[PDB]
Design a binder for this molecule. Structure first.
Ligand SMILES: O=c1ccn(-c2cccc(OC(F)(F)F)c2)nc1-c1ccnn1-c1cccc(F)c1
Ligand SMILES: [Cl-]
Ligand SMILES: [Mg+2]
Ligand SMILES: [Zn+2]
Length: 313
């Protein structure tokens, strides 16, 4: 029980900050996650032998795609770590256990393609899950990996505690379906404005947890500009590959995914910051004031993209 993971001094300090980048050393990411689980939850909440075997199986089931890869998984878990650590008293023991695992697992077996491409291609997953197609798949993979021998990190929970944490993880992963974000944030905005938002209402907590998941998932837009700018290339490498696969089905893709419309990317990032990212972090800051650094960093990057359009970079 007395085996703490310890990071070098720079990582030890910077990991606490929202804008931390986990770096290019793949073989440190597992240690970074255990470090975060230990400080966020405790050295007791998981058996190290079981947790380690879980992490390496989750890693194994993330594919070698430009963006929706193992680094994204650990990056998204890190943002959730920063929210939980800056909102210490707001979250139950089970929520802190569930949400870090939810984030690591949230894009399991992603192929780099949108729900929309699966439906137009007529992928079997689109027949199995008619909405939130990949997100239902991501949760399915999480449960399958949990059920490998020696992988059940929750085995010391009671039957109802166990059912609760898997329900937290299912809702958390489903929430990362950006199609569901818009309505979720609109409702949270209304509940915040009318003052009907009550964190003792479970259906309200679910909504707040969904928004935290959108916030952690989109967190590449809350990094220092060089990280944000370099991550955008990975994001657009997948979009443009999807664009290519659409043209192969005889469909003109939306411009975001057309590599011929590469010039339009700076304006499309403005739309994304204005339509999705800024509203997300605004409502999260209203509900959880200590996540304001995510909004401030997001606004700085909007400004950086405006400077790109105005020819200044
Ligand atoms: O930079 C971006 C530009 C456009 N979209 C996007 C994604 C998906 C639907 C979309 O259209 C909308 F607005 F109508 F929903 C836009 N997302 C990002 C972005 C930034 C950080 N993470 N992601 C992201 C990427 C892939 C997938 C993903 F889930 C997030
Ligand atoms: Cl602490
Ligand atoms: Mg996803
Ligand atoms: Zn994701």
């Amino acid at each position: 029980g007395l085996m703490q993971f310890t990071l070098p001094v720079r990582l030890c300090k910077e990991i606490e900050l929202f804008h931390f980048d986990i770096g290019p050393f793949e073989n440190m990411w597992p240690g970074i996650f255990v470090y975060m689980v230990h400080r966020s939850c405790g050295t007791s909440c998981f058996e190290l032998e079981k947790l380690c075997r879980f992490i390496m199986s989750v890693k194994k089931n993330y594919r070698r795609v430009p963006y929706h890869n193992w680094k994204h998984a650990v990056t998204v878990a890190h943002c959730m770590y920063a929210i939980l650590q800056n909102n210490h008293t707001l979250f139950t023991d089970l929520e802190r256990k569930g949400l870090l695992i939810a984030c690591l697992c949230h894009d399991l077996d992603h192929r780099g393609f949108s729900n929309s491409y699966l439906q137009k291609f007529d992928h079997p997953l689109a027949a199995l899950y008619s909405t939130s197609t990949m997100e239902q798949h991501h949760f399915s993979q999480t449960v399958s990996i949990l059920q490998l021998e020696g992988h059940n990190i929750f085995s010391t929970l009671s039957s109802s505690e166990y059912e609760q944490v898997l329900e937290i993880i299912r809702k958390a992963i489903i929430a990362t379906d950006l199609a569901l974000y818009f309505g979720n944030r609109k409702q949270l905005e209304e509940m915040y404005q009318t003052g009907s938002l009550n964190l003792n209402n479970q259906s309200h907590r679910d909504r707040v947890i969904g928004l935290m998941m959108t916030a952690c998932d989109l967190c590449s837009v809350t990094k220092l500009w060089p990280v944000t700018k370099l991550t955008a290339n990975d994001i657009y490498a997948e979009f443009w590959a999807e664009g290519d696969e659409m043209k192969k089905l005889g469909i003109q893709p939306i411009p975001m995914m057309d590599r011929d419309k590469k010039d339009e990317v700076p304006q499309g990032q403005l739309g994304f910051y204005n339509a999705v990212a800024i509203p997300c972090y605004t409502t999260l800051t209203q509900i959880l004031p200590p996540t304001e650094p995510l909004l401030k960093a997001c606004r700085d990057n909007l400004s950086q993209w405006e400077k790109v359009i105005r020819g200044e970079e």
